[PDB]
Design a binder for this molecule. Structure first.
Ligand code: BCB
Ligand code: BCB
Ligand code: BCB
Ligand SMILES: C/C=C1/c2cc3[nH]c4c(c3C)C(=O)[C@H](C(=O)OC)c4c3nc(cc4[nH]c(cc(n2)[C@@H]1C)c(C(C)=O)c4C)[C@@H](C)[C@@H]3CCC(=O)OC/C=C(\C)CCC[C@H](C)CCC[C@H](C)CCCC(C)C
Ligand SMILES: C/C=C1/c2cc3[nH]c4c(c3C)C(=O)[C@H](C(=O)OC)c4c3nc(cc4[nH]c(cc(n2)[C@@H]1C)c(C(C)=O)c4C)[C@@H](C)[C@@H]3CCC(=O)OC/C=C(\C)CCC[C@H](C)CCC[C@H](C)CCCC(C)C
Ligand SMILES: CC(C)=CCC/C(C)=C/CC/C(C)=C/CC/C(C)=C/CC/C(C)=C/CC/C(C)=C/CC/C(C)=C/CC1=C(C)C(=O)c2ccccc2C1=O
Ligand code: HEC
Ligand code: HEC
Ligand code: HEC
Ligand code: HEC
Ligand SMILES: CC(C)=CCC/C(C)=C/C=C/C(C)=C/C=C/C(C)=C/C=C\C=C(C)\C=C\C=C(/C)CC/C=C(\C)CCCC(C)C
Ligand SMILES: CCCCCCCCCCCC[N+](C)(C)[O-]
Ligand SMILES: CCCCCCCCCCCC[N+](C)(C)[O-]
Ligand SMILES: CCCCCCCCCCCC[N+](C)(C)[O-]
Ligand SMILES: [Fe+3]
Lengths: 323, 258, 273, 332
């Protein structure tokens, strides 16, 4: 077999290389150090890292958000250190439990949550600029930033756009391990089972699709590592036997194939669609669809099954039944 | 009254559902599938007597050409016609077009089947600052083998037949990615050196095992024009040679595994 | 009918079984013995689906559903319309997937490339078996497997989850989700990175491997490398199922309570209770 | 932290929907044994003589029973509620007509409540019915009761840790979590849905599209309602030792007909019955109980699904004593 595809048999060490950016070259901090074990499966060098204004802005806003969250979580366990570590997962910062419509909620019932959300948002925007800027500084296209923007947009949709569209901050996503998880079921239940939301289905199709694609693409490149298939850039500008074989493996298998450059377009697309599809789904929920299952039933798409145990009438609709 | 309702049986979500499928199919068929054809098209077929009329479909499936501005000068445009004039020592095993081809000489030397290499440029792959990227340590002075790993230099190379076929004299590193890609060995009973991709080397502490080819076959490994440089096409030639052994080193390798 | 660079690769050999008997192409498709068995199982499976669906109450694609037998039938054969079809179809599915997998091996050998793809493809086949075969065997009945229906299978997933109160707290699932999420992200990043280097925009020059290292060292302080990210991608995607399988197998055979309660091993340690 | 196979599984929905119970054998047998402690019915006695309404002096409820029957009832009552304490738990050793001890008046109301349950909540208890034992399990204080705030352990016969103490504020989350099958749902389903009939459990829309007039801003119920309902359901599931599919086809939680099982309609009646017991029988008992029995808000201990069920779909696995003690209902 090709042991190189599993790990690097013989590691190489050489001078620290640096590609100058259009700016901020003097903003790189840290001395590069090497990890022998890391070099078995990746590049051995760690750091240096680029600071910059947007980057620093990000940590500042992000740190503020986290502190607001941790303090409220600490309040939940009456500031007991041991109970805090114990109950961590169960702790959270929740949005308004009461219905205040779009009115700014009091600090004890949604206030802090909203504030943390604001700072998280600023943190994301700042980090977006960094992702976008570094590409420009290095003379690179901005494909990553645009993919990142789709993910940020999705977060904003479940974070505050959907809440705004229905007029209630109560719909927001809580901060916390189990709490943000519980929100998923609360939301799905309220909106009639997310399994029947076409956009939920699209998102999953693309999410599963990403798993399929990276597995196939990743495996494809390792399978042709002996021909330098990993050097994708020059394989794009000058097709080598590595990608000719890759393409043929696929053409012979499924009947068609991509190019070494286009397969990355497919990957980029599938990735983006997970977020775009999810966003569209959220934007339509509550706004124009109240119960996805019923919506599907309305359009005759929902499956139906025979009764196993006897069919059960709603006791509430029976005559004389209590409230 | 209902939010999203537009008629007796028409609502917003329902319309967006159609739009979404339309967007997906348009992007997949009109865009991505055309990008998939920037290499290898138009397809080819053995001409009979009189047939030189470009089908409309061959124009429709292709995207508009794009041009890559190379970092060290020049440009590349794709798609573009790239017929392979190089004669191939292969013969048809049967009559139909789907029949496999069979080598007529030495597939490793003739470079056919899994021994085939691409028509890459005869240029040395470069580093960002303009130097040769893949070079031996005798040249890449500032590069070394990490402490802890085997130093193949001096170690013998054992082929699939168990016979020692040479002695490792150097390692070629990728100065752009800090990574070893080839090993250079002195071929036993010959006045030549040969490179072997690391992916074809089982690096032991006391030897370098190579199962792709037999000791006798290290003699015909493609030769480089220079001793301290290698071109993109040579890399393909060298790599393809060993890959060819996987199927052709011995008569039984090409036959049914089970 | 051939890519411009294809002919030189179309040689005989590389099969696992069959030899020259099926070593040929039909259009762009390689056949081989496993291509023949694949078509056989597919034709068979699709025929069974069509016949079973015709006996059903609908022809609407979203509502068609071919279900396994009632639990009472245990691991035995069930009457055709009462789960028998589902059983037959499941066998054809398996036949078709494994053939497809073995066919990729022959294609790989012929091209002299690694067998990583078919190996990778074994993961999803494995997961299918966990859901349809292994778990049902551990629980003693084919009736626990999922139905073959575009929407009906979602209903199964749904109820399955809720049988454990809240499936999100299942640790095997938490791991599975994380890999699903990281993988999707990494693919976008990898796709975007390669495109940003070969397509800088305007009339600028295509960039280099060094630029790839610089971009990530700048953004996150580390660059994993070209070959490495592909190895990592295969790893991240494969683990979506490799770790998920544990959470699936555990539900029922090794845990019958709600998944949240499982976290009591942590929450209930005496020291902080 | 795992349970060894095999696992017992039932089917409650159409083949292929994965609906049904999933039980660990050891757990089921441990509960069967615990519930098997249900004292057998006392030998029947021949009704002879005048009704105790004439014979005894202060009999307000069981007055239509003959002396032998009445005493039989007192013996059962003693065995079900205060076996360790004996007759004097509710009686003055020297005057059996005295109401001096609070257990006496409470027990009188309880005789009424019990007869009410077996007579007016037949939609839930059917012909199985309940007895003092169903809840009490041999102790004056029933092992599973609720206060206006979550308390731990669920079984009050267990000694609380410092953190489990209701006074310890840092243990609040865990007290709530233990009441909702360990979830992190920040709601207490008891005070919200079972203590009274103020709230509506249903939260799912009954139309595909959002009706204009109830779908925007303050016209909408907050999403918190959905979390709460989910918490209630987690609580109900754990209380009966079952899962959601025992009652719902998750395809559509809000639908009845083929989408729900008979058990769901029964559970529906259980909710109404529990509200009736708390509002009209248990809550008022705060006026007749010692402060030591009351909660931090002076509330009397109340009942939920667990109080009777104690982790079993049917309390005491369906055991009944209805025909053995007709004095407990149904009353014609
Ligand atoms: C019982 C509840 C259900 C539910 C409820 C649910 C909801 C409510 C939603 C989804 C959504 C989605 N679901 Mg579903 N779901 C999914 C899969 C998916 C995803 C494809 C998609 C969300 C996309 C995503 O990547 O989020 C992960 C990615 C995220 C959140 C973006 C990250 C952005 C990035 C900028 C974050 C960076 C973080 C910073 C470091 C943070 C720093 C913070 C500090 C400062 C405080 C599957 C495969 C299944 C299965 C197999 O059963 C399923 C079942 C169900 N889901 C149940 C039916 N699901 C979404 C959807 O598509 O709706 C249509 C959605 O909103
Ligand atoms: C344990 C959890 C499970 C799960 C959970 C799940 C969820 C929660 C969702 C899906 C969704 C989907 N699932 Mg299901 N699923 C499906 C197939 C499908 C598709 C109908 C759809 C999108 C697939 C996709 O894009 O993936 C990535 C693959 C890609 C992009 C390549 C193209 C694949 C192609 C679309 C597959 C088409 C299959 C056919 C409809 C029928 C095939 C048989 C025919 C030929 C006779 C198959 C074939 C299998 C098998 C064989 O195991 C399977 C197993 C399972 N699904 C598990 C039981 N699935 C989504 C849906 O929209 O449901 C309606 C969705 O929301
Ligand atoms: C209420 C119920 C829920 C649920 C119930 C659930 C169950 C019951 C299971 C999962 C599982 C999984 N869930 Mg979860 N889930 C997931 C995500 C995921 C996946 C990562 C994971 C594996 C899915 C799988 O087995 O595919 C299976 C896909 C297969 C087998 C594909 C096989 C393909 C085949 C080999 C070839 C098919 C070829 C086609 C027929 C060919 C067609 C040809 C045409 C195209 C030409 C997310 C991201 C979320 C969110 C966001 O909420 C979520 C919520 C929930 N899940 C709900 C809470 N989930 C599984 C797991 O791993 O749990 C730990 C699992 O068992
Ligand atoms: C379909 C495509 C998707 C997708 C795509 C993409 N995803 C991207 C990009 C793309 C394309 C980027 O370009 C960007 C990136 O950069 O990549 C390198 C990024 C990112 N995706 C992250 C997380 C993620 N993606 C998720 C999901 C998906 N992603 C989906 C699947 C999920 C899920 C699954 O939940 C997660 C959790 C981050 C790592 C990163 C944002 C960083 C940030 O915005 O942080 C902003 C900054 C902070 C939080 C700073 C504060 C941090 C510190 C530690 C706090 C210290 C506190 C202390 C008190 C301070 C004092 C200390 C004292 C000692 C002195
Ligand atoms: C962790 C790694 C992952 C991974 C990996 C890889 N994935 C691969 C490869 C790799 C590496 C390949 O090399 C191989 C391929 O060639 O790529 C193009 C492949 C493929 N992944 C497909 C589907 C896919 N991958 C999924 C998931 C993952 N993939 C995960 C994420 C999902 C999910 C998530 O649902 C789907 C639906 C096919 C397109 C394709 C095989 C077709 C086939 O097998 O041909 C042979 C079979 C047929 C053409 C049809 C047979 C029909 C039977 C007889 C009758 C129907 C039976 C059926 C059970 C009914 C179901 C109904 C339904 C509504 C419930
Ligand atoms: C007519 C007949 C029955 C004949 C007999 C012969 C025979 C055996 C025929 C088989 C017929 C059958 C069953 C055909 C169906 C084939 C199938 C399963 C098609 C599915 C195609 C799908 C939906 C794939 C999903 C993934 C997807 C969206 C891929 C698009 C992008 C592509 C083409 C990726 C593959 C691909 C990857 C992953 C690379 O990394 C790579 C690297 C460098 C160059 C090229 C590539 C490349 O092409
Ligand atoms: C509290 C749970 C009780 C226990 C334990 C026992 N008794 Fe009781 N008893 C109780 C009440 C509330 C009543 C009133 C019944 C009614 O219908 O109103 C009674 C009544 C009696 C009487 C009648 C006395 C009289 O009014 O003259 C007798 C004779 C009696 N109880 C006897 C008795 C004995 C011997 C017990 C142990 C076997 C016993 N009781 C226990 C409540 C409770
Ligand atoms: C559950 C639905 C019950 C049934 C059926 C019966 N009892 Fe009960 N009882 C129940 C509760 C929740 C409480 C309140 C908390 C408390 O312990 O006070 C009680 C209380 C009593 C008491 C007093 C206990 C004490 O504080 O010392 C007595 C004596 C009593 N209950 C008697 C009793 C009898 C005789 C019953 C059948 C006729 C009976 N209970 C049924 C809940 C339930
Ligand atoms: C029977 C013992 C049940 C179990 C087990 C679970 N549910 Fe339930 N649920 C039950 C009833 C009787 C009702 C209606 C209550 C009423 O007062 O009418 C419900 C309702 C729900 C709902 C709301 C449906 C609506 O119309 O809005 C949901 C969303 C729900 N249940 C969810 C659910 C889940 C997730 C469960 C397991 C944790 C679960 N239920 C169990 C009875 C029973
Ligand atoms: C004691 C006073 C009870 C309380 C409080 C609750 N339930 Fe109950 N339940 C009780 C009995 C005696 C019975 C009858 C059993 C029989 O054999 O018919 C039941 C039954 C149920 C069932 C039916 C289960 C079945 O297998 O058919 C369910 C689903 C049920 N109970 C649910 C339930 C819920 C959700 C409750 C709180 C709201 C609840 N019960 C309280 C007695 C008592
Ligand atoms: C100002 C006005 C008028 C309007 C503002 C509207 C606005 C833009 C609001 C936005 C709201 C948004 C976007 C909210 C979204 C919230 C979402 C999606 C949250 C989701 C999940 C959160 C989770 C999982 C995080 C929880 C918190 C943590 C685990 C704590 C942090 C932990 C660490 C940093 C690790 C510490 C490790 C150490 C102890 C060793
Ligand atoms: C996740 C998939 C959920 C079911 C989606 C069903 C298709 C959309 C609804 C039908 C739209 C078309 N119709 C019936 C109006 O023609
Ligand atoms: C969420 C569903 C996403 C569906 C994406 C489908 C992508 C594969 C399409 C292949 C089309 C192939 N071909 C040769 C016909 O063009
Ligand atoms: C829902 C998406 C389904 C996509 C199905 C794509 C089937 C493609 C079949 C092979 C096509 C071969 N080709 C390109 C030679 O024509
Ligand atoms: Fe790549």
């Amino acid at each position: 077999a090709d042991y190189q595809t599993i790990y690097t048999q013989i590691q190489a060490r050489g001078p620290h290389i640096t590609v100058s950016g259009e700016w901020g070259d003097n903003d790189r901090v840290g001395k590069p150090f090497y990890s022998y074990w890391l070099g078995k499966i990746g590049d051995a060098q760690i750091g240096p890292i680029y600071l910059g204004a947007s980057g620093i802005a990000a940590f500042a806003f992000g740190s503020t958000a986290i502190l607001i969250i941790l303090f409220n979580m600490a309040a939940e366990v009456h500031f007991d250190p041991l109970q805090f570590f114990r109950q961590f997962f169960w702790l959270g910062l929740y949005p308004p439990k009461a219905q205040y419509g779009m009115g700014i909620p009091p600090l004890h019932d949604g206030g802090w949550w909203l504030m943390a959300g604001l700072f998280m948002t600023l943190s994301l925007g700042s980090w977006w600029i960094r992702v976008y800027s570094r590409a420009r500084a290095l003379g690179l296209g901005t494909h990553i930033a645009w993919n990142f923007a789709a993910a940020i947009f999705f977060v904003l949709c479940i974070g505050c756009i959907h809440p705004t569209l229905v007029g209630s901050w109560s719909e927001g996503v809580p901060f916390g391990i189990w709490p943000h998880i519980d929100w998923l079921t609360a939301f799905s239940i309220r909106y009639g089972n997310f399994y029947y939301c076409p956009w939920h289905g699209f998102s999953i199709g693309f999410a599963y699709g990403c798993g399929l694609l990276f597995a196939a693409h990743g495996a494809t490149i390792l399978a042709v590592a002996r021909f330098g298939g990993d050097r994708e850039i020059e394989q794009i500008t000058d097709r080598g036997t590595a990608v000719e074989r890759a393409a043929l493996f696929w053409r012979w298998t499924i009947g068609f194939n991509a190019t070494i450059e286009s397969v990355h377009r497919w990957g980029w697309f599938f990735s983006l669609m997970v977020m775009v599809s999810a966003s569209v789904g959220i934007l339509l929920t509550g706004t124009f669809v109240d119960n996805w299952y019923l919506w599907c039933v309305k359009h005759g798409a929902a499956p139906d099954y025979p009764a196993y145990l006897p069919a059960t009438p709603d006791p509430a609709s029976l005559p004389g039944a209590p409230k | 009254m209902y939010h999203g309702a537009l008629a007796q049986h028409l609502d917003i979500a329902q319309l967006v559902w159609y739009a979404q499928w339309l967007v997906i199919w348009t992007v997949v068929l009109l865009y991505l599938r055309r990008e998939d054809r920037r290499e290898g098209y138009p397809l080819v077929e053995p001409l009979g007597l009189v047939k030189l009329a470009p089908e409309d479909g061959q124009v429709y499936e292709l995207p508009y050409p794009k041009t890559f501005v190379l970092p060290h000068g020049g440009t590349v445009t794709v798609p573009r016609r790239r017929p392979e004039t190089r004669e191939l020592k292969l013969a048809q095993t049967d009559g139909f077009e789907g029949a496999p081809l069979q080598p007529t000489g030495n597939p490793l030397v003739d470079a056919v089947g899994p021994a085939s290499y691409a028509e890459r440029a005869e240029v040395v792959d470069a580093t960002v600052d303009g130097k040769a990227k893949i070079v031996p340590l005798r040249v890449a002075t500032d590069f070394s083998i990490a402490e802890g790993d085997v130093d193949p230099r001096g170690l013998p190379v054992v082929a699939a037949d168990g016979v020692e076929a040479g002695t490792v004299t150097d390692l070629w590193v990728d100065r752009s990615e800090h990574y070893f890609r080839y090993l250079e060995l002195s071929v036993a009973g010959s006045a030549r050196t040969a490179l072997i991709p690391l992916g074809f080397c089982d690096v032991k502490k006391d030897k370098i095992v190579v199962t792709s080819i037999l000791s006798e076959q290290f003699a015909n490994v493609p030769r480089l024009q220079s001793r301290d440089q290698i071109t993109l096409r040579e890399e393909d030639k060298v790599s393809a040679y060993y890959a060819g052994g996987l199927l052709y080193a011995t008569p039984e390798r090409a036959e049914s595994l089970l | 009918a051939l890519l411009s660079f294809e002919r030189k690769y179309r040689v005989r050999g590389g099969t696992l079984i069959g030899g020259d008997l099926f070593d040929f192409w039909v259009g762009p498709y390689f056949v081989g013995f496993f291509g023949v068995s694949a078509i056989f199982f597919i034709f068979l499976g699709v025929s069974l689906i069509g016949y079973a669906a015709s006996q059903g109450p609908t022809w609407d694609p979203f509502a068609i559903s071919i279900n396994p037998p009632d639990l009472k039938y245990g691991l035995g054969a069930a009457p055709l319309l009462e789960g028998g079809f589902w059983q037959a179809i499941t066998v054809c599915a398996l036949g078709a997937f494994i053939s497809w997998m073995l066919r990729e091996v022959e294609i790989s050998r012929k091209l002299g490339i690694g067998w990583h793809v078919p190996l990778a493809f074994c993961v999803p086949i494995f997961m299918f078996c966990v859901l349809q075969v292994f778990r049902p065997l551990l629980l003693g009945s084919w009736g626990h497997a999922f139905p073959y229906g575009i929407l009906s299978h979602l209903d199964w997933v749904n109820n399955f989850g809720y049988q454990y109160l809240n499936w999100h707290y299942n640790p095997g699932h938490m791991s599975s989700v994380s890999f699903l999420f990281v993988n999707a992200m990494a693919l976008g990043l990898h796709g975007g990175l390669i495109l940003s280097v070969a397509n800088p925009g305007d009339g600028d020059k295509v960039k280099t491997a060094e630029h790839e290292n610089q971009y990530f060292r700048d953004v996150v302080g580390y660059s994993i490398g070209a070959l490495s990210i592909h190895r990592l991608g295969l790893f991240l995607a494969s683990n979506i199922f490799l770790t998920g399988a544990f959470g699936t197998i555990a539900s029922g055979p090794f845990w019958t309570r709600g998944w949240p309660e499982w976290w009591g091993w942590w929450l209930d340690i005496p020291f902080w209770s | 932290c795992f349970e060894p196979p095999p696992a017992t599984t039932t089917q409650t929905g159409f083949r292929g929907l994965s609906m049904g119970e999933v039980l660990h054998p050891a757990t089921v047998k441990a509960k069967k044994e615990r519930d098997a402690q249900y004292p057998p019915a006392l030998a029947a006695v021949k009704a002879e003589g005048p009704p105790v309404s004439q014979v005894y002096k202060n009999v307000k409820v069981l007055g239509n029973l003959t002396e032998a029957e009445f005493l039989r009832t007192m013996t059962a009552i003693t065995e079900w509620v205060s076996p360790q304490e004996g007759c004097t738990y509710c009686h003055d050793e020297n005057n059996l007509a005295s109401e001096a001890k609070y257990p006496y008046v409470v027990a009188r109301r309880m005789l009424e409540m019990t007869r009410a349950i077996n007579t007016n909540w037949t939609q839930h208890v059917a012909q199985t019915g309940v007895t003092c034992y169903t809840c009490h399990r041999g102790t004056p204080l029933p092992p599973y009761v609720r206060y206006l705030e979550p308390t731990l352990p669920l079984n009050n016969r267990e000694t609380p840790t410092h953190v489990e103490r209701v006074e310890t504020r840092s243990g609040y989350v865990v007290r709530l979590a233990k009441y909702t099958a360990y979830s992190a749902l920040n709601y207490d389903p008891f005070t919200m849905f079972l203590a009274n009939d103020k709230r509506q459990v249903r939260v799912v829309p009954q139309t595909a599209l959002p009706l204009v007039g109830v779908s925007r801003g303050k016209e909408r119920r907050p999403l918190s309602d959905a979390y709460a309902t989910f918490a209630l359901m987690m609580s109900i599931s754990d209380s009966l030792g079952t899962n959601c599919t025992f009652c719902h086809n998750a395809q559509t939680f809000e639908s009845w007909g083929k989408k729900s099982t008979p058990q769901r309609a029964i559970a529906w009646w259980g909710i109404r019955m529990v509200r009736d017991l708390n509002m009209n029988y248990l809550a008022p008992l705060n006026a007749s109980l010692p402060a030591s029995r009351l909660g931090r808000q002076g509330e009397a201990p109340q009942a939920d699904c667990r109080t009777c069920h104690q982790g079993v779909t049917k309390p005491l696995f369906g055991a009944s004593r209805l025909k053995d003690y007709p004095e407990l209902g149904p009353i014609k």
